[PDB]
Enzyme design. Structure first.
Site: not given
Ligand SMILES: CNC(=O)c1cc(Oc2ccc(NC(=O)Nc3ccc(Cl)c(C(F)(F)F)c3)cc2)ccn1
Ligand SMILES: CNC(=O)c1cc(Oc2ccc(NC(=O)Nc3ccc(Cl)c(C(F)(F)F)c3)cc2)ccn1
Lengths: 263, 264
Positions: A20, A24, A129
């Site tokens: 949505s 990534v 969340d």
């Molecule tokens: C299997 N795939 C993977 O291997 C893998 C994937 C990834 O992809 C990602 C890339 C970016 C993010 N963005 C968040 O994390 N944002 C976030 C939003 C609000 C709030 Cl409140 C917070 C907080 F709480 F942390 F501060 C954090 C998440 C995952 C990273 C590392 N590995």
């Protein structure tokens, strides 16, 4: 001393996931990194306001149990670069490939999930969340917390506290609210199962948990689950908001009832 | 934002080390953390200027191969809190408990030491003191870079010092190249598992010869299986002439390439 990465630097690698409100892309920038691309066709007004938050709120955190923020990117699509993490999410581990964690490990996965959360609130950052799906076990050791979701805005109900399901006010979310979740993540760790598993109907679980008719069956915690734990578990899942403990107290509990185990 | 941590929060734990300009105390703050205490009796003027740097320069970095900066503390002594790392420093591993690293691992410890350093320069941050002693292998996997020293007024160890630096030009000898030479010695360490000039038992001399170009690491010690592609690069860095050494973007790429080719 800002964190914008000039375009033409982050070598956008292959795809990881997409939904949505995001995509990534396991990329490249001085090392493996995860790049979350937001827009496409063009950047939206409501959208843009979102980005300015998932960032302003990310850069405010700086702790070993929270997903590291490398930098952002206004250039070719808004983009948030965070360290790449090898391994898989807690939810994956417990309910998909069903790995069997030695007990001690479980208590510590919680311990860390606790430290992380305890830090996020100190910086006055409500997660809104948390869930086993956002608890990433880096390199199969070290919990990395983040909002690994992509179909939200800022869904999933199992970790949703009663008050939130009901929505009585305008801002149901709060530190307490987050704990209830942690409470379910804990309940997960100790029973290795999801809640309301026998009820096959989303609408109902939503309703009962809201009215206080439903609650996790704490009589599933493993045979050896510390009595000190199950206690705390229930201490969190408390249906009344103000009856749940903040995290400074949670962390201390786990930690204490930890040094008394390895033997 | 601001990363000052109100006093009465970081539960100063036991002692870890202490010297000329600092004391490290494994403490507590939302989790295990290392707290570097600077002053004592009272904070000094020259001292204070130092702190404002080891911090302003720390908070400017944000990468997985560089020691995480949690926050600082003006309260009860100037204090820099950085994530605690369990495990030990590269120098410890190679020359103290003499662990025997499978080869692949060695090439990767370097790989990471390279990424870290490549990031530090991007942010325009010259380390001025890289050495196997500042390369910390976190949890026995993942290189964490920092200036784990305490006998040098920050932001005593000549082996990793490049020739030009020993001699001292105009006012400022240090430069990206300067750092590479060090990385060159750290590499030479990894592949021979020994320190340089080991047979010469006299600090003043090594200092002098390395300065005049009379001395250089005996590259004929690299392990039997050390990739010919590596030993090459090693020497590429230890180049006594400054402008003849490569920047890190090129270094990293080299290691990485000559890495994917050896498993199957
Ligand atoms: C299997 N795939 C993977 O291997 C893998 C994937 C990834 O992809 C990602 C890339 C970016 C993010 N963005 C968040 O994390 N944002 C976030 C939003 C609000 C709030 Cl409140 C917070 C907080 F709480 F942390 F501060 C954090 C998440 C995952 C990273 C590392 N590995
Ligand atoms: C065995 N004891 C440990 O377990 C342990 C000890 C610790 O103690 C420490 C506490 C603080 C620091 N201060 C630096 O690191 N400052 C720095 C200065 C310039 C530059 Cl240029 C950089 C750079 F390059 F990294 F950015 C970093 C170093 C070590 C931390 C984690 N673990």
């Amino acid at each position: 001393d800002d964190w914008e990465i000039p375009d033409g630097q982050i070598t956008v690698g292959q795809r990881i996931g997409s939904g949505s409100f995001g995509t990534v892309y396991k990329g490249k920038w001085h090392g493996d990194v995860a790049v979350k691309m937001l827009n496409v066709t063009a950047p939206t007004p409501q959208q843009l306001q979102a980005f300015k938050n998932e960032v302003g709120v990310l850069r405010k955190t700086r702790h070993v149990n929270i997903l590291l923020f490398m930098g952002y990117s206004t250039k070719p699509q808004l983009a948030i670069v965070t360290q790449w993490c090898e391994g898989s999410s807690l939810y994956h581990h417990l309910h998909i490939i069903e790995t069997k964690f030695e007990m001690i490990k479980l208590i510590d996965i919680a311990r860390q999930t606790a430290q992380g959360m305890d830090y996020l609130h100190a910086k006055s950052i409500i997660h809104r969340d948390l869930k086993s799906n956002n608890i990433f076990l880096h390199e199969d050791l070290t919990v990395k917390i983040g909002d690994f979701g992509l179909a939200t805005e800022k869904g999933s109900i199992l970790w949703m506290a009663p008050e939130v399901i009901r929505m009585q006010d305008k801002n149901p979310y709060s530190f307490q609210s987050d704990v209830y979740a942690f409470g379910i993540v804990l309940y997960e760790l100790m029973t290795g199962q999801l809640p309301y598993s026998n009820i096959n109907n989303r609408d109902q679980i939503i309703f009962m948990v809201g009215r206080g008719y439903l609650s996790p069956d704490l009589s599933k915690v493993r045979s050896n689950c510390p009595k000190a734990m199950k206690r705390l578990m229930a201490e969190c899942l408390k249906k009344k908001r103000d009856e749940r403990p903040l995290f400074p107290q949670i962390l201390a509990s786990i930690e204490l009832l930890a040094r008394s185990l390895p033997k």
